[PDB]
Amino acid sequence: ETVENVSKESERIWRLQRARTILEFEKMLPEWLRSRFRMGELDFRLCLRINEVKWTEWKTHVSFLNEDPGP
Amino acid sequence: RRLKKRIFAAVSEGCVEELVELLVELQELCRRRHDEDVPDFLMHKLTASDTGKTCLMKALLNINPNTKEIVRILLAFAEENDILGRFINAEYTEEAYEGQTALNIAIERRQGDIAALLIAAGADVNAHAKGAFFNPKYQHEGFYFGETPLALAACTNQPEIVQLLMEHEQTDITSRDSRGNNILHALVTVAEDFKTQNDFVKRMYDMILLRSGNWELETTRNNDGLTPLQLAAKMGKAEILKYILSREIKEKRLRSLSRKFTDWAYGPVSSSLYDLTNVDTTTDNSVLEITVYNTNIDNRHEMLTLEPLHTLLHMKWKKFAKHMFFLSFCFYFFYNITLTLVSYYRGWLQLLGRMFVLIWAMCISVKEGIAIFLLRSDAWFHFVFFIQAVLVILSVFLYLFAYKEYLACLVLAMALGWANMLYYTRGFQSMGMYSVMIQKVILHDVLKFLFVYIVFLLGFGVALASLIEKKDCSSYGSFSDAVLELFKLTIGLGDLNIQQNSKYPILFLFLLITYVILTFVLLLNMLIALMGETVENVSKESERIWRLQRARTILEFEKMLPEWLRSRFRMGELDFRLCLRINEVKWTEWKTHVSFLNEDPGP
Q1: Does A56 touch chain B (CB under 8 A)?
Q2: Sequential DSSP letters for B79-145
Q3: Are the C-beta atoms of B527 and B449 separated by less than 8 Å?
Q4: 3-class SS at B573?
Q5: From the CA of A55, how many Å to the nearest CA of chain B?
Q6: What happens on changing residue 422 to A (chain B)?
Q7: For the purposes of burial, counting CB atoms within 10 Å of the CB of B12, is it exposed (0-12), middle (13-18) or buried (19 or more)?
């Protein structure tokens, strides 16, 4: 019964158990060696690219930050 | 000067009253001395110098409620200066987006009326966006769609522009891009499941193929030499494949385009003829051979259940492959018996048996070796048959020498040879599903338990063997004896004596009780509960995994046949195609039958 119950939940408990070691290893680093931070400035904020694709709603795009698409 | 950047800024927000003054100011600059010429100065000023982006592309990228008046004014200004041929057909130049024109942007920005006004003004509908973005390498760098405007309007669910493009008589539907793909390969390549897109791609395939009206698009090979049918089989797309394999076009004047043919129907009873032209093993690279031998695709067992494939496998299982499978089983069984008796009992009458052992081992090691070296989970039994054949000839080569290590090869070839007889548990459904249950349990649960049990056993073995001081007064004298005595204790053999030669008996007893709790109570009884989950999961799937495992032996036995003896092919000619009868009955819809191929129903 408990193996049936935990099996739809345990994949997230493992990720929660791993993120603690992620953050403790982040804390172990010195004042330097944190050249491992994320993407640059773009009125300028550190950002993060996430690409995505969806054939669902098909609205025309008027709220873009860049005209030419590719990197 | 600052004129070109001002018009580029004006066409972005929708500054139309600024635009009508900037254009007339630009043609006041036309009255100034050019020293190049009249029109190419307007091309130098109206387009950017970096990448080739015109003001028309700059306006169409930035859709606002004043867009159509802006592009109308721009096209009228280009019309009144005779530059419209090289304005509306301008392209990019940079290597990422090379080939993109303004119609390609207007189609993607969902502007149907602006695209109609573009092609009504003399746009190029055969443009090719052959850049690196439009022909990417992975799924997130760009968007492969077929690099034509027609394929872009098709793969973005815009059927009105597709109708308007196909009604244009300058449109080239049979075009081929840099991959060699026509539009139908591109529609296959874009297509996905129903949970991602609600099957517009099947309807676009239907509309484009019906508006074509001929067989040229379906029978065109790309640069890998694949039709759209073979490409849909290769990439594993069952939703478009189920449409293409069973395609009934009801009306006349285009009915050679069909693959199914309802030839007679009486009441609810009806027989149908499925076409088998590129779907049968008689050709080189067929649909069935692609979908059976596919390795990169996960849902093969949802594609073999399709309508002209499932009966096609059953027919050649019943015709020749059942007897061939039974014959191979009897040969391998007699080979294993003759190996077993020879190994167990070690003259003139019983020397032919060793010959039959040797020549069959050489034949199996040849055949399985040239089976492994042309394939580059689904190939385990080839390896095990090959090792079982290699060990016999290795034992023969060591028996012709004076080495006594031939028996270690013979015993290993005999035990592995009898374990290999579970390959023939396919052929029966009830035992084949049991065998694939055995395989899934070995993969998912057993060795995962074995790792933790091994680290517990070897971690408690040194711990128990360390606190032993020394007549053989204790069984736990060393590491090897301690792990042997701990291994005998978890399968329930022997006796448990705790009067060992230890200095700390309470710590010895505590470690032994901790081992009993950790293995006998926790681990072995959690193995049962964990395998119950995978047995529950595989049981609604294993009946298809067995069919997929059987169809490989079907096709390999098909390959084993000579150039003759393939009188086992399917039904005759009916302008004549090899067909396949499938009878069916349904009391569901009750429509009157006007699309039959034969008046008199029965055979």
Answers
A1: yes
A2: HTTT-HHHHTT----SSSSTT--HHHHHHHTT-HHHHHHHHTTT--TT----STTTS-SSTTT---S
A3: yes
A4: coil
A5: 5
A6: Impairs channel activation by tetrahydrocannabivarin
A7: middle
CA separation for the pair A60, A68 (Å, rounded): 16
Contacts of B153 (CB under 8 A, 6+ apart): B107, B161, B162, B165
Straight-line distance from the first to the last Cα atom of chain B, in angstroms, rounded to the nearest whole number: 85
Residue A17: CA count within 13 A, CB half-sphere: 6
Q: What is the signed CA dihedral for B294, B296, B301, B302, rounded to 10 degrees?
A: -110
**Of B129, B202, B212, the residue nearest B165 (C-alpha):** B212
Would an 8 Å CB–CB cutoff place B133 in contact with chain A?
yes
HSE (side-chain half, CA atoms, 13 Å) at B497: 11
To test the contact with chain A by mutation, choose from B13, B50, B61 the residue with the greatest count of A C-beta atoms within 10 A, namely: B61
Angle at A52 between CA A49 and CA A58, to 5 degrees: 130
Residue B51: closest CA among chain A residues belongs to which residue?
A68
Give the nearest partner residue to B197 out of A7, A55, A60, using CB atoms.
Answer: A55
**Do B128 and B99 form a contact (C-beta atoms < 8 A)?**
yes
Binding-site sequence positions of B: 492
Tell me the chain A residues in contact with residue B200 when contact means C-beta distances shorter than 8 Å: 55
Identify how many contiguous H helices and E strands chain A contains and give both numbers: 2, 0
> How many whole angstroms from its chain centre is CA B207?
26
Any idea what DSSP says for residue B255?
A: -
B110:A60 CB<8 A: yes
- CA B144 to the chain's CA centroid: 18
Residue tagged 């000579």 (tokens): B562
Residues 6+ apart with CB under 8 A from B438: B422
Write down the H helix ranges in B213-298.
228-235, 238-245, 287-292
Amino acid at B343: S
CA B481/CA B234 separation, integer angstroms? 56
SS3 B225: coil
For residue B13, what is the nearest residue in chain A, using CA coordinates?
A62
Method: cryo-EM
Of A17, A65, A68, the residue nearest A43 (C-alpha): A65
Q: Angle, to 10 degrees, between the axis of helix B238-245 and the axis of helix B307-316?
A: 80
Residue B275 has a CB neighbour count (10 Å cut-off) of 19
Asked if A70 has any chain B CB less than 8 Å from its own CB, the reply is: yes
Amino acid occupying residue B316: K
CA distance B218 to B245: 12
Picking from A54, A62, A70, the nearest residue to B96 by CB comes out as: A70
Whose structure tokens read 């005209």?
A67
Query: Between vectors from CA B144 to CA B138 and to CA B150, what angle results, nearest 5°?
Result: 175
**SS3 labels along A13-25:** HHHHHHHHHHHHH
Q: Which residues of B are annotated as a binding site for Na(+)?
A: 492
CB spacing of B96 vs A67 below 8 angstroms = no
Whether B14 and B64 have beta carbons less than 8 Å apart is answered as yes
Resolution (A): 3.1
Contacting residues of B for A71, CB less than 8 Å apart? 141
Are A53 and B530 a contacting pair at CB < 8 A?
no
Calpha distance B187→B165 (Å, rounded) = 16
Nearest CB neighbour to A4, from listed B197, B526, B533: B533
